[model samples]
Target chain A: AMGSMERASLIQKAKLAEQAERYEDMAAFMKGAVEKGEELSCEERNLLSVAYKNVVGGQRAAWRVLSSIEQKSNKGPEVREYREKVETELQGVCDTVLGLLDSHLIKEAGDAESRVFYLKMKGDYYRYLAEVATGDDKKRIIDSARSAYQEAMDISKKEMPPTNPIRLGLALNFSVFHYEIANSPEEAISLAKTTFDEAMADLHTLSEDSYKDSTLIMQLLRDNLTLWT
Target chain B: AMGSMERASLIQKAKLAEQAERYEDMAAFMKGAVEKGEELSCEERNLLSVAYKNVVGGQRAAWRVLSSIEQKSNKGPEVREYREKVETELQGVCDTVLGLLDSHLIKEAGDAESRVFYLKMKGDYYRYLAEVATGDDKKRIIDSARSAYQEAMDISKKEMPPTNPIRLGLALNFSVFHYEIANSPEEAISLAKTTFDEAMADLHTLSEDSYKDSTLIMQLLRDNLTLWT
Candidate 1:
């Protein structure tokens, strides 16, 4: 593990790099700190996330660590303000994604994988809306989200192959939505089973002991499958 | 009522003024719209409140109208994001108030009024903290808040007169704290009755038609006294 002096020096560099608008370098410096077993505060992790977001090639990876930290900040007064701040930014993130869709600036029109990714993001936001909303509006937002996923599924089948990773992600989310919403248990279980079967078959075709990531996917599929059963 | 065109025109002018950071002018433009009987959207009302906050100090008043709008935003998906934003701001406002106390900037010397206000603000933040906190933390925060109010009451007795508004407010809040926390029924009722009696006695010292606000305070005290009787 890194000593306190080393951690402090690393953090100082990150701060100075951030001040100079060298966001990529700031993120790299923090990543080095993390690799050296320096524990980062939630605030520091958040700063690193911001730095990653500012860099051109780091957007996708920015959310991985952040998503976990944001979840951890979800309760208690000690971090209530922090959670609220992150959730507020989540609102902006959703808005930006939706704006991209509206402006035809995302790859939704041309690339099948990007299309699935964009639609899943739409579905995710609406699911959040549904969870927070009350009465008929909740139902309406969920239905709207369901339709977005359905459209993605249609595109996945007709435009891209069934075995695509993007298609798997979308299907998993759609299954989760149905499972969560009270009125659609049968659809959720049935859909989950179908997705599970397809994924397993696809993995089998790739051969045993090869493609560890695909094996991980199969395990996730198995775990989710257990949730319904 | 003003025509739609006129109301829209007023809103347009207010928006421009706001963008230019001319908050007082934005408020004036919107006040004209209200005086013209133009119906305000919740968004417009929020903007008007924001303008008021920026002008010669009506932030507490600004929140009175904005607070109800925030509650209305709580139930639906459409405005849930806005509600969360307002709630988060409320957290910051509370934090900032508490921060003032910690920094010794608020009650540093012999300013009795600022000292009372600072203590009361500290009590208020503790009340909020208790509401959001869990388990032992909730009890600890609530007790801490009560101590702050008790200190304010002690100061009011030794430093300020019995008829002071700060004393009355602190007593009322202390009674409320007792009423809210379990196993304090006797303390709550006794405190409430004592507060009511003092308030009534204070009002009696005023001329029949003078200190109209004191009469209002007495009426409020009477209502609280009735609660336990």
Candidate 2:
């Protein structure tokens, strides 16, 4: 009872942090709850993923700006220092969340949906890292992203219906990973086209709750197909 | 037919500009279409407003940053110069859009919804200007914002159903103006509360299309109520 109470308190703090757009604090609060051996509900896991995603997202934007400045300006050393600082922060958050997803969230995922969600998140953060990585590091990170996305894709195909939003969302992001990180436009287009077609054939099977979300992803998939083609 | 063809060509360029996130170009394309004496379709009007809003939004953000730097750092001359530059750009876009709305869009609005939308937009840009204006200028801009919002509100109340998304949206922004610009929490809360309650009573009358948009604004209204309370 006390453990549940503490977990609830942490989640409340995490919610407040999310509303305030303080994702760093939200991540900390959620991390504390997970560290205390509380099994996260699906909602809690989503919040955790969102918090970490946004925390790294800010650093990623900053790094891009600093990189642009470095490229355009003569202030090489200063701009490089700032860019490296943002990169380090970005990589740190990515690594931390990736670790949490692997060592805890994925391992403790109570259902296939949660499992697929965490694996997709794992792929997403690796893709973020791969964006700024160079040389052999970039190659390694890109491979990791592909592997995670592939695993999630495999599970989503078997466990969730084609019209299930989670399944469709997984396909959308995986296709994006192929296009972006793997530089496999052919693979990306094939994946997107197949998924969108499959989902459309099963469109009538979607529940009222998932109708909007599933269709939105379908539109995104078609959008990517159009862009890639 | 030639006029329609020219208008369509300009709108196509505007669409591409929007896709590229180049609102300056988008605004120029849209401005040309409007200047050609081609009556804009509802979609084109929306695109035009969005383009100008985004163009000014960027300058608003830059001005805020420069203002903060001016307040914090001792580099007064350089910071002040940069801030003034941004401010001028922001004010220019605001003025241009406001003129377009007053001289053209509002006059040609064929329906109540478009009129209310344009009026709300008028209120919005004035409020943005008031954010960075000073003394008498600030007072004048704020009055303009209030008058625009009040006129929109009055028309919305009379001409639109309670659950109409545009009407609800006008109320939402008008309430926001009251709270943020007029510094009248009482008026903001009263307005939001009344609009939300009225909508809730008529929620079942909402069409499938506007249901999501209206409920989302309702949530925003409730969120502000909580925050203000």
Candidate 3:
């Protein structure tokens, strides 16, 4: 009775749809239900993100959310199997993204920001690859991810204005990637200070909309700084 | 969509109820939905039987259904945990039944059949105990099961006369326990033949209800015969 009966029923149906692998329907139902009522339960949020992955495109977003919830709870059988399925899809995605990069299919964004998202996604997949791999394979993947992140940063600085919203977020993640897997604390510390330094400059011009993202990234940068210290 | 939308909603609610372990409420909801529906999906049937196990009064029925489904599917974490729960409950039920027998708490049945049902349930619990046990524990549990079954058969013959329906069911289970677990196929065969002998002798006296029980037992006996051969 903690939740209303009707909402509980809706959540139950969404759970059934998730288990059945009716991903699109599951997403639609659960997203609406979660929105209308209280905050999504951790299970609902994690599973809805999965259903989003299966809804035709963007294994990238699904993989990221899956990674977030990976430590939240022990999943059911279908969810466990679904995580495996996503892991396999991660391999497929990394191969596809690598192919796209090899063929120069990723359009460069000199001034606009959307193309930067693709670079971040490719980097994310490579990060995922590092997780499931070991030894030389892990080293190779982490190396590629660092290169992609560095390229994205380089483009963000040269082409876009300093106050572009994605820049701070990108820098923080790049710093963590360097710190955790790229075996380069210097780059991690360098990126953290630089993003923090630049964001302080931009905070004078940061709009209310950008303020939230900037504040969050600033907190991460401060935390990242402390870790290095 | 193959099922009516309402029934599907009901099944979903039932799933939530099950997850919440509101077993009595879950059983009532699902059993009605299943009986009214065209056919029970395997998931529904499996979960419904689980709800039955959790209901307060009938662990005997629940345990048998559980045994039937034990091998049917790959178990979810909940189902896997539930099986362990059932195993623990089996020990509890076995102790309670053994206490009943030690105190001679089983009531007499001159023409009524319910008291015979108690002996059968005790026999069932011991049979279950033999399953999760090993070595000396297995032998002791199975031996106790055999005696409980034997006593039930004796009482059914003396007090309840020719068409005592519990006789056939008890005899068939005893035969299975012998052949399958007790390492005495000869005893199993002998018991089958004797049950067949009694059925023939009482064929003229059996009511329609008695005939139904005999027919089912005979089919089991027939299947057991083929397995041995």
Candidate 4:
């Protein structure tokens, strides 16, 4: 485990964009760091996720200011250009992540911490798509979601120290996807019961480390499933 | 339509619990108001999903106070009991919403608007939930998500209104679920296409009274879907 200082160093690097007031560059650099940081250890990759999300947050704030200007002004040529520019930038955010997400190879090599980070990254990415995509685009958004989830699950299954709680919690999440998205309560309850049993079985076997990492995930799923049942 | 005033009235009642400087009453009132609010119309409900999420934010505040009292402080009996009461109240927020979220009724509802509102409410409900549940609880949490999506679709299909933008947007969302959750990208693409077409066709037909209501939703969904295709 990299101690406190190592984690702090990574955080400092990640925050460079924030320090310099270069949000767009910061977001881009953080994205680059994320894409490159994959080869780092679990702890390091987790650090990058924090950095990436933070930069994205900064980018959103910058855009919010730009949005205020455009809304206050007429849709003049300059306004049109700015809107297009902002839209294009947002598109870039989705496209790059979606493109990387489409590849199933990343999770195979990611560590337990990284894979879990990927889970959140996947959710954030899909959420971005949903925010931007229109009626039909939702399909693509969902596809992006499923793809990321499947890849994340693949990683969980492949984790070196088998039976890791984080891996199990995430994999079980993907494993039971069909049940929660059921068309009817009867259908939802049926699958909810089945998945709950599967989770309970997995929980009984966790190690101490996993107990901390996986415990929250397991209970959330169980309680939700039981409610359905 | 329940006017915004009535929504304000309910909030006023909840605030009364605070005016007396009674947090217990405030907590109970806000909790009940937010939860029992599932029964109100969309406007009357005034429990904006985005705002509700923002209020809870990362769920850090609630957990912070609890942790301080339980793990760090010299807890008097009052403190201990307050902790349990607050936790139960928190759970009550989840319980009332989740319980009334009965997917069973979505399948039974004849009005498409009502059904779709309930469905959207359920999803909005869980996004908050995913934030709060911890340890083994998160795993258990995943259980209801699937049904929440599917049941929404089940009702969406049964109750597709020709001219409502929100309904069309939701319908498209439901179709995305069919594609993404079912693990069939082709189906997801195809269903999304159809839903979008349905929404666009209905857009031209909305009455002047509902145009503002319809425009924002349909326009957002309409423009967004084009990127995916």
Candidate 5:
């Protein structure tokens, strides 16, 4: 955005409201950020919408977090439409990044643009969503995230296999989603093993630093080793 | 408020074509109005932000309008967020208008300012929503609409009483919600009796109206009252 400071201010306002448990204000500021505003840019609006949504999602997240950390609201009636906005925001970000990476938009986006970076970001978001998905939903959600990752990868490498930092980050998570979502603990473990071995094989080409999934996937496999066999 | 003719034309343009029997254009117009920027005082963008709200409440309106309505959508995944956007647009109009009246922005709205008159007009929108509210969600849906009615009544010099028109309308429906969410038929019938009587009495103010208890309620009460006794 042209003015990251104003964007930061809006976010700070939302965060302040959130910290105070001023949910309605946080919701209002978030909803305001998304609405037609001369003051906000598309990215700012999107970020705001997502932030606002997460506040709503946080109601459930808070419910979960508090349920785990504290012990209130474990049996309270959930407020209406909790997490509804965040779901929308997440989907919006996914669809949009897809649209941006499509044909003319990607050419315009150039290499290493944040939009391109966020495509990977969004892929991870969905991949995480897939992981968190329950029952039959897990299969569908993970598959969705996997498909998105593949699409992002395809759009990624114009010449060589995606050498871009984010592109690789997305690819790693893509394999992780496949292994985890496949629900074959053995496959997941094997993939995790492969990940470490492959990391050693091409440590030079790997991302500059530790990534989120490298540790997480290994932990998932290690914790559920019985499933791996 | 001025140039209502153009507003009307644009509103007509915004209206969606009906699916089959219902005034789908009216629904579409409302939807499109928020999307295409018609009949709205503010940009649909701002309206879209809050438009995802359930103004009329309940799933009845969606069922009545959308084809292939699914049951057990509760605990089911959302198809898309445009659904939320549609909801926001409907509720946003009421909120925006209510905010207008509350701000006393309407006091200077001109002696014959249609905005004041339009306050009453606004109720009709919710009324349309209420009319479609059916089955399980009928009451909550009506409550949503009735709340809008109350919002309009706040500025319309309308009486606020146990049997005032808006009160009665809201009550009649609220009783249904009371009944619907009740555990037993006895409770449902009891609440229904109270609400129906109140509404019936209120209807008598403007014109002669007659009422009788629902045959089901009457029968159940007669049977159940014997048990209690």
Candidate 6:
């Protein structure tokens, strides 16, 4: 039987591992807490997200570079095999995290902010899978990503203020999903523009606590707007 | 007084560093050889390109992530300062390599393959800069990228065979420039389709030496074709 003290210890170890950039260890520790059927606090859930995100993000980056190298070179069978291994590992991580989100984390999210955060993460991991997926799998993952982002956006707008960082971040990632995964630059531009404009109008209402984050996301939106337009 | 033996030694060290993934050391050793006014062999020039490409590629990746983080969070002044420092360093490396390519490398390229390779590098580094640049600077860099890719494409078509890996590589990068930098998916698809079709027609003529590389690039072209269309 897992107790609260043991769960707290695992979370502590995960935090330390994350600070040290040992993401595999962080994931292991966090996954231990998650699997014990212990209810996680908001921060603990984010800690799980961070660990899996970094681990998966590293694999995705490696897969991209390795795949490009394999595509560009006349590599031997060994190298091609290695690239395939990386691809498999990347896909496995994405699937694991997505499963965790849908099965446990999202259902357990206690508040609007936490739900928005998990939904955005769901969309993000789906988009990552869409990057390497093809044919019918790609279409299904793209639809899933769009649905996740759409749900996250709907909730964020209703529950969070315009000056909130979480809402702005959802908009930013959602727009990125449209532009990159959905291949809709016009939609990306429109979404980013409307969000940025709305945030700017509420700039004066931004609290000191979230002023930096809100403003920073606004800048990114503007940056993307400039690049897209 | 840099002797031929000394230049050879530098090239050897750069090769070793590249194998070890010590790209900064590789760039330093190669830059030393390049600045010596010694005419580089095709392999030596390629070594230089590899060194700088890896170094700048790493920086570009870091800059992208850092810039995104900086834009997403309201970090303290120290963190923001560090991000700006990274941006500055990235710009510096890009400018240094572009200068070396234009002032020393291109004019001294010994053959058509070498020339095409150098020109492609020029376009690639410029596109890297265009990623972070804005306003008139972005415009200027985009035009430079387009011209470099165009020149390389023209030369590759005339000088290299359809099955040559270098020629196919040029087509791959050129089409990416159109799609990503120029924001013209139609042009990208058109160019890729024409190249893929032409290459497929000549597939039987592919040399065994280049069979893997050429076919692999053709696969990439088709992948992009599927993605974009």
TM-scores for every candidate against the unseen true structure: 0.35, 0.50, 0.36, 0.34, 0.29, 0.50
Clashes of 4: 34
- DockQ values, each candidate: 0.01, 0.02, 0.02, 0.01, 0.01, 0.02
Model 5 segments beyond 4 Å from truth?
A: A1-108, A112-116, A127-142, A155-168, A179-195, A204-229, B1-229
Pairs clashing within candidate 1: none
lDDT of 2 by residue, A1-229 (tens): 2244366667765765565454676788787777777467878878888888787776776667667667777522444644675678789888888887766778888688888888888989999999999999799999999999999998989898898877888888889888887889899999999999889898787677778878988999999998999
TM-score, first chain, each model: 0.57, 0.92, 0.57, 0.53, 0.43, 0.91
> Candidate 3 on B81-176: residue-level lDDT in tens?
334555576667556445543444354323336556557756866786786777987888888888878778777777765545567777888888
- Candidate 6's error at A228, in angstroms? 1.9
Cα distance off (Å), candidate 5, residue A65: 6.5
Which candidate comes out best when scored by lDDT?
Answer: 2
Against the hidden true structure, what lDDT does model 4 obtain? 0.51
Judged by TM-score, which candidate is best?
A: 2
Ranking by TM-score: 2, 6, 3, 1, 4, 5
Task: Answer with 3 or 6, whichever has the higher lDDT.
Answer: 6
Q: What does candidate 5's lDDT look like per residue over A4-27, in tens digits? A: 324344454554444434444455
What lDDT does each candidate get? 0.60, 0.80, 0.63, 0.51, 0.42, 0.80
For candidate 5, what is the lDDT? Answer: 0.42
Candidate 2 global lDDT: 0.80
Q: Compared with the true structure, what per-residue lDDT tens digits does model 6 show for residues A143-204?
A: 99999999999998989888788789889999999898898999999999999988989988
Clash numbers, per candidate:
0, 0, 0, 34, 11, 0
DockQ of 1: 0.01
> Candidate 1: TM-score?
0.35
